[PDB]
Amino acid sequence: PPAQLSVHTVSWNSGHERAPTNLEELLGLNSGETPDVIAVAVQGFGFQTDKPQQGPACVKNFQSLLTSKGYTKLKNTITETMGLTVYCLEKHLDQNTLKNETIIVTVDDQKKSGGIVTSFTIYNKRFSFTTSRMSDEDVTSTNTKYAYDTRLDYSKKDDPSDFLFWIGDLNVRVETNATHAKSLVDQNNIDGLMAFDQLKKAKEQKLFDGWTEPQVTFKPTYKFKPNTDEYDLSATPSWTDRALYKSGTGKTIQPLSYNSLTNYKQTEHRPVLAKFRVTL
Ligand code: HEM
Numbered sequence: 001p002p003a004q005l006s007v008h009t010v011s012w013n014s015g016h017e018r019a020p021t022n023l024e025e026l027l028g029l030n031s032g033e034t035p036d037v038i039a040v041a042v043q044g045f046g047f048q049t050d051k052p053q054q055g056p057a058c059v060k061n062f063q064s065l066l067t068s069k070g071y072t073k074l075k076n077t078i079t080e081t082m083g084l085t086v087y088c089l090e091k092h093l094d095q096n097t098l099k100n101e102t103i104i105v106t107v108d109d110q111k112k113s114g115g116i117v118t119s120f121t122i123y124n125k126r127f128s129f130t131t132s133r134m135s136d137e138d139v140t141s142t143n144t145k146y147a148y149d150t151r152l153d154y155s156k157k158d159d160p161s162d163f164l165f166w167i168g169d170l171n172v173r174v175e176t177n178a179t180h181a182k183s184l185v186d187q188n189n190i191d192g193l194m195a196f197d198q199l200k201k202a203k204e205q206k207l208f209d210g211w212t213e214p215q216v217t218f219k220p221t222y223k224f225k226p227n228t229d230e231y232d233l234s235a236t237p238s239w240t241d242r243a244l245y246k247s248g249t250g251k252t253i254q255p256l257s258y259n260s261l262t263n264y265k266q267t268e269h270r271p272v273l274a275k276f277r278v279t280l
Pocket of ligand 1: 012014
C-alpha cells in the first residue's frame with residue numbers, strides 16, 4: 001500500500017486529426033517517468049462511426065507502447081464526439097476490489113453533448129475520471145453553455161470518490177475581444193488574459209464546485225492556423241483543453257506540472273498535459 005501515487009492526464013480537442021506518432025511526449029513519458037495512472041480524453045467528430053478507420057491504429061499504437069511499460073487498459077469509451085481511456089500499472093490492480101465502472105451521460109437527443117465517467121479502486125481508494133462536451137447552442141441543465149453536469153460529478157455522491165479528475169474542453173472561453181486577447185498574449189500577461197476566462201464565472205454560478213485547475217502559465221491553446229504558432233483571430237484566443245482535480249474525501253492532490261504541448265501543431269488546438277501526485 002504505497003503512501004503516494006502519480007497520475008498523468010491529457011486532453012486534446014483533436015477534431016479529425018489522428019493519434020500522432022509521438023505518444024510518449026503526449027503522455028509525459030519522455031523524461032523517464034512511469035506514472036501509476038494515465039488518462040487520455042479526446043473531443044472530435046465521428047469517433048464511433050470510425051469512417052477514416054483510425055480505431056484499429058489507435059489501439060495498436062497505444063497498446064504496443066503501454067503494455068511494454070506494464071500498463072493495463074481499464075477502459076476505453078467512445079461516443080460520437082468524445083473518447084476517454086484510462087490505464088493503470090497492472091501491479092496495483094486487485095480484481096476483487098477494482099470495481100471498474102463507466103457511465104455515459106447523453107444530454108441531448110443527437111447523443112453529441114454530455115460526458116463519460118470511468119472509475120476504479122486500488123488500495124481501497126476510488127479514482128474517477130470524467131470528460132465532457134457541450135456545444136454553445138444547447139439548452140442545458142445549468143442554463144449555461146458550460147460542459148458541467150451533476151451526473152458527471154462523483155464528488156456529489158453518497159459514496160464519493162477519493163481522487164477525481166475532469167479533463168477536456170469545458171466549453172470555457174476568454175470573454176474579451178480578439179485584439180485585446182492577442183495583445184495580452186504578445187505581452188505574456190497570462191494572468192491578465194485569464195481574468196477574462198469563464199472558469200471562475202462558472203464557479204461563481206456553483207458549477208465545477210470545489211474543482212481546482214492547476215496554475216496556467218501557458219498561452220491560449222486555440223485557435224491556431226494549422227502548422228503554425230500564429231493565432232487565427234477569427235476566434236478569440238482561449239484555453240479550450242483543461243484539467244481540473246478534487247477529492248470527495250479530503251485527500252491531498254498535488255499538481256506537479258500543467259502544460260500545453262506546443263509541438264503538436266497540426267491542428268487548431270494544442271493538447272494539454274497535467275501531472276499529479278496523490279496521497280492515499
Ligand atoms: C489524436 C487524437 C486521438 C487520440 C489521442 C485517441 C486516443 C485513443 C485511445 C487512447 C484509444 C484506446 C487505445 C487502447 O485501446 O489502448 C482509442 C480508441 C479508439 N479511437 Fe481514438 N484517438 C484519437 C483519434 C481518433 C479518431 C480521429 C477516430 C475516428 C474518427 C478514433 C476512433 C477510435 C475508435 C473506434 C477506438 C476504439 C477501437 C477499438 O476498441 O476497437 N480515434 N483512441
